[PDB]
């Protein structure tokens, strides 16, 4: 399905024209016959993209109700429902119990579902911003008369004609043109117009002059070419089919949770059935034994839990929204904390996407301007005579002009009508020199000979401002070797001097060096036209040379380059420290790509590829060993040729890599290669070129402003800000939470034990039920909720950025050691704290504990009005029931009291409460108070005895569990201490979360 597209394309571009004609069965001049055009559509079928199959049915909502977890609550709700049904064999009470519970359950599925769904109901939308980029009609030649037709009609074979300002409708073989230039950013990610011509320039079809591609727009000129490729056949539409209908897949957090439900269902079920077989020894039949199995669901399943994790995720997410980091998906909050490798697009992602000057050579010395946006470097030289006379030519011999739109924004930043080179010069001179308009004003421009392709140099004659002269100055610029041929002298400092042979090299010398940088080089010279040959008035003759072209005064050289946003190089190095690998992936050429890699730190100083080594080392390329060359840079042309098992090895082999001149599929290939590796990749990209990649990445981040519509739809996240830094913050926002979530799990789960044990003791001991199903819902739904959520505020026990990425399979979110801790140890202290309160309330009433055993059948027996307590007093049904209802309420409180300790303990895994401070978390302290106040309400406030069977407690009753809460604080406090400092052994490797 998806594979074939991964390979590069294979072409026809140095087929001859007639030949092409005879393949397609088409006429060059006259074009397809209307007849033949139609027949060729039905065979091929339109020139259009297939309705983004994957049409997520609004019904999706329902994907949320299910999941795995919601499934444990549905099973559970449905188990409650079946038990109520099974009751129905008699006369039963479940009218308040079992049906209420199974409702509380499904209601917790539904609700949590709707929350999640809502929040999620904000992001989707890709194929929508992708076909916000489609021409409409086109002008085909058929029979031999042309005619703009609906695009979709176009086929393979037909003659098409494109002029400046159109979209190429389909892939096309250029038969005829001229001056036609095209924009091929869609393929390269690079906007500078490329020339089309009827001869094949090169082997690579992506490279030849003769093919023009769909998803591209003809920039200027005019041209005709034969449709090689229509619809989803074109180079691009392959790239198309290769994305949207991409499959999102599970997150890690989502996976850790489904693992969690796996350990949970694993105990719930194994105690639930074990409560069957024990039951059955005792003297319960199939009837009763079955009842308890399913009864054993609620104690086990934290109802509690789904909503806490979401609130916790939600809460973290609105700290990040404040960070100017938006998050579309709740699950995304964690992810970040796993990203191994980042595949980043260069242009507009890493880089500002712009251009500028670099340095000048004048005065025989190489000069390094400042290329940075908000210009953080140093002013290189203002003093020289040489410099101004250079500054003069740069401002005058220049046709460019800044847009009105602008005086507000800074000079680097404002848009300029003209070619890239001349805008550079204008900005340079605008920034160091003063207003350019001032200068041009001043030295009015008499006559000028525009930059020909021929001359390869542009000149102007200006009347000099110095009023005392207003004579004529000649300024020129253009190919460095063409300027020189052009000179007799050099302005070295202030004076001229004889372009000896020595300065012919020095120059020669600067030229070659600045070339190397991968910088564009221009040459500048000028001439003080002798007044006594050119009278004040004189005609010049841009026509033919009535003035001197030769023996001029070589002024100096200017070059240029390109830099990246500001935060990037830093943003890069944090990541590596994070121990993530960064990989550049660009459409752009290799000199540039590498220079940036070196700037940002993807490539680290004297890291080396094999071709750098060959240089210093003076040696070939072979007798270099590839191994030595940590770094790599691989040009797409070479990438095409390799098998995916040669890609994988490059990928192991090098720690700093640069894939340049890559096509979109290739960007796609790389990302897949990295994933075969089983590494989590983030693709960071701005363009339509980056679409498949982005679509392919575990997480696709798009620059908000710059980013094509296409990358944005493709992407999971968007850096509104363009702020690359945000990517580091994004990676951190997915660790802390991870740990704090375990604390809240440990916290919640602990309570489960004090909740289960009463029921079991009930069936085993034959005592009056200590704690009721309604009581339980107050603890999970109510009291536990603030304190659980409360954990998300907890800080770092250690500098988290310091440790390596978690190995996903090895270190789960919920592991045995949490269960043990929660169930086996802490919990269990809580249970006793609970049971204590039960004996105290009954004992006080007259029912001593010894007499309690085997009572339940008399105590539950509705007909004995008579029940004799230890003292001898007789209690009615109702009166002994109020007493048991009071216990239920006390037990409920016990747990909260014990939960206070559990809260404090759960605030730290390793660290004592003392180093941490259990203190600075304000949210947690609010949970202790907003959970006691709840308890006290359920107990105190009238109505509560009838509605929720909660009875008022005496002051004494509160303090029963207090020895139990204290012991928990202490017990854990001691355990950690003892962890901290045997870090290798036993406490740590059983209890440490």
């Amino acid at each position: 399905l998806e594979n074939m597209k991964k390979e590069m394309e294979i072409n026809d571009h140095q087929l001859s024209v007639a030949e092409l004609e005879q393949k397609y069965q088409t006429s060059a001049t006259k074009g397809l016959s209307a007849s033949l055009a139609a027949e060729l559509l039905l065979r091929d079928g339109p020139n259009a993209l297939r309705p983004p199959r994957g049409t997520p049915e609004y019904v999706k909502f329902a994907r949320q109700l299910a999941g795995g977890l919601q499934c444990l609550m549905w099973v559970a709700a449905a188990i409650c429902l079946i038990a109520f049904a099974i009751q129905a064999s008699e006369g039963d009470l479940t009218t308040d119990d079992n049906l209420y519970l199974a409702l509380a359950l499904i209601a917790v599925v539904v609700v949590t579902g709707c929350f999640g769904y809502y929040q999620e109901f904000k992001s989707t939308n890709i194929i929508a911003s992708f076909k916000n980029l489609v021409p409409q009609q086109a002008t085909v030649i058929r029979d031999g008369d042309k005619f703009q037709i609906n695009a979709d009609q176009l086929v393979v074979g037909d003659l098409v004609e494109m002029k400046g300002g159109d979209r190429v409708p389909a892939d096309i073989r250029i038969l005829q043109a001229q001056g036609r230039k095209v924009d091929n950013s869609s393929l390269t990610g690079e906007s500078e117009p490329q020339t089309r011509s009827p001869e094949c320039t090169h082997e690579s079809p992506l490279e030849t002059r003769n093919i023009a591609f769909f998803s591209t727009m003809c920039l200027e000129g005019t041209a005709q070419g034969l449709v090689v490729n229509t619809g989803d056949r074109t180079i691009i539409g392959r790239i198309a089919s290769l994305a949207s209908g991409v499959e999102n897949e599970k997150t890690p957090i989502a996976i850790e949770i489904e693992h969690f439900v796996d350990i949970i269902a694993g105990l719930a079920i194994l105690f639930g059935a074990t409560f069957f077989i024990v039951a059955m020894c005792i003297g319960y039949t199939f009837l009763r034994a079955m009842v308890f199995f399913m009864a054993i669901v609620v104690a086990y399943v934290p109802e509690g839990l789904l909503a806490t994790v979401t609130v916790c995720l939600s809460l973290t997410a609105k700290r990040l929204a404040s960070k100017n980091c938006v998050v579309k998906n709740l699950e995304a909050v964690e992810t970040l904390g796993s990203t191994s490798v980042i595949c980043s697009d260069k242009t507009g992602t890493l880089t500002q996407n712009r251009m500028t000057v670099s340095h000048l050579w004048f005065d025989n010395h190489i000069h390094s301007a400042d290329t940075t946006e908000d210009q953080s470097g140093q002013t290189f030289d203002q003093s020289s005579e040489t410099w101004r006379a250079l500054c003069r030519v740069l401002t005058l011999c220049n046709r460019a002009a800044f847009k009105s739109g602008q005086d507000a924004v800074p000079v680097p930043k404002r848009i300029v009508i003209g070619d890239a080179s001349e805008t550079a010069l204008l900005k340079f001179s605008e920034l160091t020199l003063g207003n350019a308009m001032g200068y041009r004003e001043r030295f009015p421009k008499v006559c000028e000979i525009p930059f020909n392709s021929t001359n390869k140099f542009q000149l102007s004659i200006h009347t000099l401002e110095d009023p005392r002269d207003p004579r004529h100055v000649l300024v020129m610029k253009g190919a460095p070797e063409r300027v020189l041929e052009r000179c007799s002298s050099i302005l070295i400092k202030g004076q001229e001097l004889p372009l000896d042979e020595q300065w012919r090299e020095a120059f020669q010398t600067a030229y070659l060096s600045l070339g190397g940088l991968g910088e564009r080089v221009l040459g500048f010279c000028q001439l003080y036209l002798s007044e006594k040959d050119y009278p004040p008035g004189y005609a010049f003759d841009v026509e033919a040379m009535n003035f001197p072209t030769s023996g001029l005064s070589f002024a100096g050289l200017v070059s240029m380059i390109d830099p990246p946003r500001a935060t990037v190089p830093d943003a890069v190095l944090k990541c590596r420290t994070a121990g993530i690998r960064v990989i550049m992936v660009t459409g752009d050429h290799p000199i540039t790509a590498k220079a940036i890699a070196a700037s940002v730190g993807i490539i680290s100083e004297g890291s080396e590829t094999v071709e750098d080594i060959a240089a210093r080392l003076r040696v070939p390329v072979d007798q270099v060993n590839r191994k030595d060359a940590r770094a790599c840079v691989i040009n797409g042309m070479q990438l095409k040729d390799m098998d995916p098992s040669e890609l994988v090895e490059a990928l192991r082999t090098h720690p700093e890599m640069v894939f340049a001149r890559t096509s979109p599929q290739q960007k796609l290939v790389i990302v897949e290669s990295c994933q075969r590796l089983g590494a989590i990749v983030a693709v960071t990209g701005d363009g339509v070129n980056d679409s498949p990649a982005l679509k392919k990445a575990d997480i696709g981040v798009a620059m908000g402003i710059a980013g094509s519509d296409a990358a944005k739809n493709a992407a999971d996240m968007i850096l509104l800000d363009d702020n690359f830094a945000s990517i580091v913050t994004g990676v951190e926002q997915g660790r802390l939470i991870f740990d704090n979530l375990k604390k809240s799990i440990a916290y919640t789960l602990t309570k489960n034990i004090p909740e289960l044990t009463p029921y079991l003791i009930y069936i085993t001991v034959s005592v009056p039920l200590p704690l009721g199903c309604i009581t339980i819902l107050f603890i999970e739904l109510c009291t536990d909720i603030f304190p659980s959520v409360s954990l998300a505020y907890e800080k770092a026990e250690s500098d988290i950025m310091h440790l390596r990425p978690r190995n996903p399979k090895r270190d789960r979110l919920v592991n045995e050691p949490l269960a043990a801790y929660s169930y086996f140890q802490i919990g269990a202290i809580q249970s006793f704290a609970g049971f204590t309160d039960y004996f105290t309330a009954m004992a006080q009433e007259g029912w001593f504990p010894l007499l309690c055993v085997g009572l339940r059948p008399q105590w539950e027996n509705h007909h004995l009005q008579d029940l004799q307590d230890s003292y001898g007093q007789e209690w009615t049904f109702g009166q002994r029931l109020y007493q048991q209802y009071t216990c239920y309420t006390v037990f409920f409180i016990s747990i909260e009291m014990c939960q206070i300790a559990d809260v404090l303990i759960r605030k730290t895994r390793r660290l004592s409460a003392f180093q941490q401070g259990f203190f600075r978390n304000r949210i947690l302290v609010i949970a202790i108070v907003f959970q006691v106040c709840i308890g006290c309400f359920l107990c105190y406030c009238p109505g509560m005895p009838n509605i929720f069977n909660f009875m008022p407690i005496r002051f004494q009753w509160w303090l029963v569990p207090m020895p139990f809460g204290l012991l928990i604080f202490v017990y854990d406090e001691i355990r950690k201490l003892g962890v901290r400092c045997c870090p290798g052994s036993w406490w740590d490797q059983e209890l440490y979360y």
Binding site: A828, E845, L864, Q865, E874, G878, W986
Partner: protein
């Protein structure tokens, strides 16, 4: 999965669950020490007495007469055992739920307590204390009869304990 150490997990739980059950007993046994052998700390639950009947769903002692409360003394161990008093259309014996130091006070439907017993001393203080006829000419129908006790000390709770100072039952003699 410990392939050794289980051992380090066994010695552990045996002298830590151990430790935890010897603290828990610790607190039960403190709590039990602060309660009277003879009377409960809170009588409140039992506050108004209920009425219950036998209808399953003496020598020693002292001859008495219908009279005023017979106080026995304090609720204390140093007088031996506090001396108690004596006493085809089915028979239903009603009785008033004991409660320690309580003094009850006193000084047409289809066809169909003597103070001297109180206070009740409570079982430690009085082992064999004994606490204190629908001849109807309708057979062949299910009658409902509510019997109830009156007094200042006695309250009913229509909404709750229907037992509280009353009964509700449904005889039936089919002959």
């Amino acid at each position: 999965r410990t392939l050794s150490r289980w051992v380090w997990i066994s010695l552990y739980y045996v002298a830590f669950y151990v430790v935890m059950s010897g603290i828990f007993a610790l607190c039960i046994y403190v709590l039990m020490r602060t309660i009277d052998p003879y009377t409960p700390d809170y009588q409140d639950q039992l506050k108004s007495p209920g009425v219950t009947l036998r209808p399953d769903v003496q020598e020693g002692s002292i001859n008495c007469t219908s009279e005023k409360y017979f106080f026995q003394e304090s609720f204390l161990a140093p007088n031996h055992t506090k001396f108690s008093c004596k006493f085809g259309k089915p028979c239903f014996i009603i009785k008033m739920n004991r409660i320690v130091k309580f003094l009850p006070g006193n000084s047409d439907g289809p066809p169909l307590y003597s103070l001297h017993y109180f206070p009740y001393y409570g079982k430690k203080a009085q082992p064999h204390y004994s606490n204190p006829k629908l001849l109807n000419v309708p057979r062949n129908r299910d009658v409902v009869i509510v019997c109830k006790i009156l007094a200042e000390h006695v309250s009913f709770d229509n909404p709750h304990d229907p037992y509280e100072g009353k009964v509700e039952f449904k005889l039936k003699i089919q002959k």
